[PDB]
Amino acid sequence: SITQLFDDLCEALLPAANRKRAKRSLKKVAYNALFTNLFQLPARNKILMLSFDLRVGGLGPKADRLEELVEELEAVGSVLDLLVQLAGSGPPRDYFLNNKHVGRNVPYSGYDCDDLSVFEMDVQSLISREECLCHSMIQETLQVMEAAPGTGLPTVGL
Amino acid sequence: ITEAALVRDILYVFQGIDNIKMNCYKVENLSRSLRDTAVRLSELGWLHNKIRRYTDQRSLDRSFGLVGQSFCAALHQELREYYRLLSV
């Protein structure tokens, strides 16, 4: 049902509410764009090149997880080759973290000051989020409260 | 007395070197909200003295043995790090 699997795909990406002619026109954009590439390298390596860029900017264990799944997905190759293409298109606690004070046999470390320095940035981002909200909540409504009479109002636009 | 001046002396009281003077490091003006937090912070430096006197009084006599050295010379690897923090 390859002629239908493109028809069901065009429904999901259609945002819910003419919804009867847009699907007819969006199926054109699906075909008008599918045959441009057709007119005109291993698989796991492309993940590692993205695994590297993970570890550099921190978040090591997540990168050790991305490789943990592709190792069990072996025991389909063309599917992961599609996900690596859309890697950047997406939209933008645990106390048993470092916590040298809990464990069975925790090894000697001495002060770190590189875990407490990335434990105050975990808090500084919190106070900087709940402050942009109050900057994006008093702005979205004062831009309407003070304007020309009848701009932001939809009933006056009739 | 500015808050910055207190931050200047405290970074010394963490070592033993004394506004803040020398068993609590009695500070001697400024507001009560400042003296209280200095008191607790200054006292941490006092501890550093008690651990320094031992590794200096017993590093003098030669009749402490062979174990009493590996102890008095393992209280120093746990002090260089405390000297790296004061650096930062």
């Binding site: 000051c113 590189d114 320095s117 | 790296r84 650096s87 930062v88």
Partner: peptide, 15 residues
């Protein structure tokens, strides 16, 4: 090689 000159640690600074 703990007797001879080694590079500085960078831990003394607040990296």
């Amino acid at each position: 090689a703990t007797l001879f000159a080694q590079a500085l640690p960078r831990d003394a600074h607040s990296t």
